Amino acid sequence: RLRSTPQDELHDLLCVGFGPASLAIAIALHDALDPRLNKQPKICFLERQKQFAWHSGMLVPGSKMQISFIKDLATLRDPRSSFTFLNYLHQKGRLIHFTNLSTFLPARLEFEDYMRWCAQQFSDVVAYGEEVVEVIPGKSDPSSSVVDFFTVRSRNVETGEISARRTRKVVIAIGGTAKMPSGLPQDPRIIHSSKYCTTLPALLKDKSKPYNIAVLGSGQSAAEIFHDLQKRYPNSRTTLIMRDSAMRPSDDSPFVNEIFNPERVDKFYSQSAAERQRSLLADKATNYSVVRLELIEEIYNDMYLQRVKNPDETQWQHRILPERKITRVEHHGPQSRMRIHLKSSKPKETLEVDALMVATGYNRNAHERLLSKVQHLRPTGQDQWKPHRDYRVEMDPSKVSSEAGIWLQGCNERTHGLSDSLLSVLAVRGGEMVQSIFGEQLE
Amino acid sequence: RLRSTPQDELHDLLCVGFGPASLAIAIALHDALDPRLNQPKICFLERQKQFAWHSGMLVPGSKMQISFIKDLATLRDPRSSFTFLNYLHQKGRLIHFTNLSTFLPARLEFEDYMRWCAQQFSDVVAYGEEVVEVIPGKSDPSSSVVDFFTVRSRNVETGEISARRTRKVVIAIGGTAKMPSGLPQDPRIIHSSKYCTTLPALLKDKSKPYNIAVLGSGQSAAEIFHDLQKRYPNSRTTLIMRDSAMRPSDDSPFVNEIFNPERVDKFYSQSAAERQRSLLADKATNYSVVRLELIEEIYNDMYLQRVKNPDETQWQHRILPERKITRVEHHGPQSRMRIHLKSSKPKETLEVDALMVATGYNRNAHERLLSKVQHLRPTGQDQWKPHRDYRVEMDPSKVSSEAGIWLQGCNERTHGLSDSLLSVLAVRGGEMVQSIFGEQLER
Amino acid sequence: RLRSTPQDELHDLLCVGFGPASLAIAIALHDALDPRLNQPKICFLERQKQFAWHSGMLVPGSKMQISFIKDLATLRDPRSSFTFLNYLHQKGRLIHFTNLSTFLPARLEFEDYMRWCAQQFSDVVAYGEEVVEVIPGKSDPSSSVVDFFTVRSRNVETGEISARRTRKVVIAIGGTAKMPSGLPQDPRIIHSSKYCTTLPALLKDKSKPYNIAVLGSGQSAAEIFHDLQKRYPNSRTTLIMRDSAMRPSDDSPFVNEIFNPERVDKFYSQSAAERQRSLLADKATNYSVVRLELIEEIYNDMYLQRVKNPDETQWQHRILPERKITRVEHHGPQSRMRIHLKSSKPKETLEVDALMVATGYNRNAHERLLSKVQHLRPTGQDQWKPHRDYRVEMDPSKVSSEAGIWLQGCNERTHGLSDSLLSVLAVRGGEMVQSIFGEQLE
Amino acid sequence: RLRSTPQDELHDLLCVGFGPASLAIAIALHDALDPRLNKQPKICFLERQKQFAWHSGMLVPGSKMQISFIKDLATLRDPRSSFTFLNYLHQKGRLIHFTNLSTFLPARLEFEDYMRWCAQQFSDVVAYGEEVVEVIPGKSDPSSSVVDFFTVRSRNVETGEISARRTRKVVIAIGGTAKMPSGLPQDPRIIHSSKYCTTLPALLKDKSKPYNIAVLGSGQSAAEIFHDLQKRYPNSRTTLIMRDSAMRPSDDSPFVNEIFNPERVDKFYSQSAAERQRSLLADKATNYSVVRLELIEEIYNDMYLQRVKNPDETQWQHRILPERKITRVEHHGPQSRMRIHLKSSKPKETLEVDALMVATGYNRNAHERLLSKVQHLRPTGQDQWKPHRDYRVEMDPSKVSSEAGIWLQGCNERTHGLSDSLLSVLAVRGGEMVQSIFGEQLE
């Protein structure tokens, strides 16, 4: 229903990224325009992938959502929305079938399809294959001392051509970038977890071959990869390398998990920086460096069966090496394998591996580089973009028109809480964003 | 949305009973008239003084036995405003229920949801009306053809009789208590359906060492037996069952596809012999079975008695399996009742202060209620025959086409094990609205 | 420590079979001989070359269906050296098993536990011996009374016949494959009991798109159906069942009291009518049922196919309910058989490279084995009748009291649903040692 | 089979305390003397309580063990022992019935009965009702300057009379003592969790009275008390006061829990003090200030039901006050209720309560007072007892004979790991203790 804006027109809103966060904004805008639900803006979305896809590099077989399907992209804002997960199922003729599953945790493949089904209804306003590379200040009058729009430049991921689009307002919703240990070198055989399903098969084409494959880390991504490798490459020898002493379980308990409630964002944001830092630390185990207990137990059971076959752990096909860090990687010459050097992680062993899967998490700072050509518009003394409660970043008012602005989505954990980077509050936050950006225009 | 019809007018439809089945029809009619989602003269008569859902069995901790997705609207249209999720959103409780991580709300909570739905229809529901007669009406003195029905109800407070005229009747009156034959009439012999409303009046002192027997081994018997040991901590309770053990309900996913709304067509279109065979083979999904978790809790309570005393005969709370009651003897209120037991195979004497009889329900009450119109059935029929759309066969030479009677909730034999449950109410509500109002709504 | 008896001597007891039932007797005799806890001339004959527990069905990930406490000793004496926990302690694995927090070891692990037990009786077990007949013996040329038995066994690898003489015999030979009568004999039609041992030799290319059918809907059919989809990832598998659905086994605690060892006394004393009715009423504990967790796993795999394609007819792996096989075309050089299906209610065909037949077992094989002594039964018996202590009725005028035959594992009709399982083996082994050797040990 | 030594004789070993730690030693000595298990020392145990009892003040209805029954007092050392939990069940005629329970976690009540069954076989070497008060040095030749025995002085609970027993070797196995926040005054209405079942009923006799009852803390003891009070006093208003933001789940994941393995004691002890501290910190959530998830979920569901009835948390019968600390208690005067003053626990609110349950944990320092009169025998420069791997404390060899010594049990978490104070390694540690104390004597 949302109609396209011509590429060279002045947009009202341009969103960088079309993952769940921008999709929830698109959905919330649709719903706010729906006479059936409420009491058209010139909008477009740029997405570097060639079609909608949700962490496709980590769609390992059997992987599940880590959040109740009720926390979809609409329901917590309005269960009557056409964009609920249950309505998607009903449109697919699968609602009763999903009901008989008796699970709150769909396969990630299914929840990706739900979001693909939503995203297809916005295809007229999404430009796929466009990687935004810079955002530059615009002036309607060149002799004005005030920026009143932004030019967003994007690179065609197939041809390299640079496109430009003008917009009053920008949303940056680009998720995370791979965090690599600084000491690891670049090599086609060292692959971050985010590119597991998508590039490792190309590297290791023979599923029956006895590859040596190592996994670095001990959070959910590492555990899913380590566990999947033993099925994907049944004759491989896999090694899980972690600096902790053990995989530790994610905190799914209900009182702790109320920090993810949508209505907590007001209170979290109003707290002092010192309190927000302490709170995030105390609740870290709900999300970071932890594994769903059910997957830990599965891996533990697999280890036990190896113990039944051979009591000597050093002889096991699949091994966990706890409290170790990689200190050196040899990787030159035509030989297939790298030599990983391991030391204790407390305050030498070597391994010959065909590939090293690096499951060491994500950073959420890439908006600083994307926004570098407008960062002179920030107030003096800021080395970082500062979002208000409504996610609009602070601009020097002598330099930027009140009609122009930039909002950040998904990189605001420090100011808005641990739910900021997840699916947890997207339905409600998308509704807040539509009111913040479009509210006056709608009325 | 549904406006009252003056009590004197010729109604389009009168529904007898305002339990979940009739409520689902009201909701389906509301949704069919809702321009977001897509007036007849309708009224409902309910004997209870307000909406209430097996209030006599609202024992503490009792839970739904069916996923909340099978509420009164979602399987027909997840966008409906009458979904359980939207009810939670309207109550400010949606996020809190999400953190519960359960498909099975407390029965108390699901009653409040349906009561919240029911309040939307307060203009078209007359509470405290017990329907006692359905009378054939002939608007033409010069024709013996019946073209409407007069429904007579007795007000439970005044006892006055009121009459309403309607073209069509829905009979949606649930079940009546099934009692073993030959029990004496004694206020201390109480059917499970009146457990919460009658037993506390009879046994007022919660600390007294009452002897309380429970007859049966299905879900009602297990919930009552388990609850009595908490409600009367010093009581001596006895579960009497003719089976050798409580058996677990079948909640496995392939078997339970028989409850899918789209299976109604398939079940109906089978011969009487195959329908009868089907119901028998699948009986363990519903009848004479207990949810495994409750079985396990009762078993653990029994085990703890064994820890304290190895002699089962001296336990406070006991199960007497493979027993039948030969008679319940009484000598007035001055003394306990005496339950005489023998083997249920093709002996004990119990002295009790009350006998909870959890022996299930019959769904044949519509036969008495419709006795004054049964001469309009085709020659030879001794029971009402519903077609697929739930309308009973009438002799077409005796009843007009504008007049009809439908049955809801008593049609297991022709429509499947889901008929008496919540399982297909949302979808069946939609079909009923089509069958009864479809043309009227098309014009 | 059970010492061997010279083969030509007259044994006190000869046991046919060395599966868990006979093994539980050996363990109970060992424990009865141990003054720490509290020698007859005994020998066991086993057709397999070593101890093995349904090796043809040791599917990856398959689990015990009974708590490890019902091992081969604990319910009779938790102090026994032959408990599962002591075995783990001896293996250095007890703390590691504890951390699993499960009552259900892998079948592979429980087999190893019983193998560890069985290796301690190697002095009294002859493997590779298939018993073929039991013939009566009369040690007195002047009396017509049978007072011993000769057990004749064919060596598996040499085919040579050996004769062993014994006063008492135990038959503990488990079950035989039950096949639907209308199926023909073909290398591509394999009973579930030979899944792991026979199917790989027939279907050698783990990556080829075979069509593989599975007949039945009990635990065996479910385990094979689910496993085939991993073992042959490109196969098209089909579960053919005459019921409408896989149904869950009853593991609920009151019902499962029927497996309690002390229940055998009460069950045995019931009438034949009551025992038959009782067995029927409790059938869902054991027969034609699937553990709920596995049903749900199979259901979830079906659901994921529906996510990828809503048309069930085009799914890789399918279930075909309320079907019966009316005909199999298997003659010809074509690698695939054609299966003809009809409704099982009182024209579709499948072309398959193999049909796995998971249709259960019979436990009547002792009738053929004992045929040369069946004239010793009392008149008017067409079956062997076990007493409570598992000794079969013999005509007193024909058989001396110091001679007898006991049956193990085939007495469900008289001793209850626990008879064929591991459930009462520890306790039953103790009772058997008392019945067979009790007067001898006192 | 262990026979009494006359009270006035020189014992080989005297154990202070007869809880699970001392009982495990008694069991290991018995097994070491059994020719079945391995092909008599003068020993006595002194126990303050009148019979064996295992945290009887916290035997709340429904409380369960938090460790697999396989970790009983013998099995991990020798599954053949007559003192295993499975053998105890067999002796009681309950083994099959417990098997049908399908649980690794007996009721605490049942596990206490198991240990009482073990303890009663040592009744000839245990003096109950004896509170040890001091350990004093002994010189068999008083003119010499070498200590070669110890006199253990104990107060008879019934008569207060002091008796003295002499021994070469002493074991201190006295568990923990109630830890109270230093700011709380002494008052009969302020009760530590350790005395909940035994003292609170004496204080609040009428189970139907609407008492106000507060609970301080958020570990397992606070959760069990908070949950139990709501059943024990159905009309009470209970309040859980915690300085954390929420109850947090205990870590029962299997890799982490390998720290409780008996064979890990060697690994843990052989680490530096820095690394022992760091590791105890990393694994703290297995044991301290945490609650079993299933209990958290049950309390959460009870709170949810209150919310169904009334969305305003301030009106709930039972409430949780997070991030609070008690700053003042008013408790002088004849009024039934104390006034508790609360403030935020972050770096005006009052409650009036009939009682305050203090679930603030335990200290394990009480051995230092009992050994004060021998702490001059430590080597020069120690102000704390230093146990070696085999749990014997370091003595100055020029002052203490090699045939005399003191061992500590249960208070050595610092040096021996998180399992030290639990049942986790008692079977194995008992065997080790028998070898250390009586090894040469038996060989």
Ligand SMILES: Cc1cc2nc3c(=O)[nH]c(=O)nc-3n(C[C@H](O)[C@H](O)[C@H](O)COP(=O)(O)OP(=O)(O)OC[C@H]3O[C@@H](n4cnc5c(N)ncnc54)[C@H](O)[C@@H]3O)c2cc1C
């Ligand atoms: C493997 C994995 C599984 C997860 N599972 C869950 C879960 O089950 N439940 C849950 O609540 N959360 C989960 N998360 C957390 C995750 O962050 C959210 O699920 C969600 O993806 C966040 O949405 P988003 O739109 O903020 O970020 P993303 O999903 O990362 O989306 C960002 C988008 O922007 C695009 N983009 C990036 N840079 C540019 C650019 N320069 N120009 C144009 N486009 C660009 C990317 O291609 C991407 O599509 C998971 C995270 C990972 C890594």
Ligand SMILES: Cc1cc2nc3c(=O)[nH]c(=O)nc-3n(C[C@H](O)[C@H](O)[C@H](O)COP(=O)(O)OP(=O)(O)OC[C@H]3O[C@@H](n4cnc5c(N)ncnc54)[C@H](O)[C@@H]3O)c2cc1C
């Ligand atoms: C204790 C109990 C618990 C159950 N729990 C579940 C569950 O968790 N999930 C599930 O799917 N099903 C459950 N059921 C099955 C139950 O039948 C349905 O939940 C549902 O109540 C059926 O709805 P109904 O409108 O058909 O009948 P009812 O709910 O019985 O309602 C019929 C109505 O008609 C009224 N009535 C009867 N006679 C007259 C008259 N002469 N005049 C006027 N009014 C009359 C009654 O007062 C009542 O309000 C349960 C049944 C029982 C007994």
Ligand SMILES: Cc1cc2nc3c(=O)[nH]c(=O)nc-3n(C[C@H](O)[C@H](O)[C@H](O)COP(=O)(O)OP(=O)(O)OC[C@H]3O[C@@H](n4cnc5c(N)ncnc54)[C@H](O)[C@@H]3O)c2cc1C
């Ligand atoms: C696939 C499968 C899985 C099962 N899993 C379980 C479980 O987890 N828990 C449970 O309680 N029960 C289980 N059962 C039931 C099973 O019957 C028992 O576990 C157990 O195997 C019975 O032991 P048995 O010794 O009486 O028979 P078996 O285990 O069958 O042993 C019989 C032995 O006799 C031998 N034999 C046969 N004929 C001769 C002959 N003529 N001469 C010499 N030797 C002969 C056989 O080789 C065999 O070794 C399972 C059954 C099957 C088929």
Ligand SMILES: Cc1cc2nc3c(=O)[nH]c(=O)nc-3n(C[C@H](O)[C@H](O)[C@H](O)COP(=O)(O)OP(=O)(O)OC[C@H]3O[C@@H](n4cnc5c(N)ncnc54)[C@H](O)[C@@H]3O)c2cc1C
């Ligand atoms: C409420 C609670 C529940 C617990 N549940 C578990 C569990 O389920 N699993 C687990 O692994 N651990 C559990 N623990 C940990 C607990 O420490 C162990 O269960 C166990 O109690 C340790 O035994 P111990 O003998 O070292 O100390 P205790 O059990 O404390 O025994 C110490 C004994 O010494 C006696 N004593 C003390 N001082 C003197 C004196 N001066 N003179 C004479 N006698 C004295 C006491 O009377 C007492 O009997 C629990 C602890 C608590 C508080």
Ligand SMILES: NC(=O)c1ccc[n+]([C@@H]2O[C@H](COP(=O)([O-])OP(=O)(O)OC[C@H]3O[C@@H](n4cnc5c(N)ncnc54)[C@H](OP(=O)(O)O)[C@@H]3O)[C@@H](O)[C@H]2O)c1
């Ligand atoms: N199925 C799903 O829904 C799914 C799947 C995957 C991930 N996720 C979610 O995505 C988010 C990220 O999870 P993640 O596992 O990818 O990342 P993560 O939680 O941040 O874990 C990163 C792991 O790598 C380690 N690590 C980080 N830097 C390291 C370094 N320089 N050297 C050595 N080790 C290092 C970390 O150890 P330290 O803690 O010591 O730094 C940790 O073990 C989580 O919220 C997760 O739940 C969800």
Ligand SMILES: [Ca+2]
């Ligand atoms: Ca949860």
Ligand SMILES: [Ca+2]
């Ligand atoms: Ca289910």
Ligand SMILES: [Ca+2]
């Ligand atoms: Ca069970």
Ligand SMILES: [Ca+2]
């Ligand atoms: Ca665990």
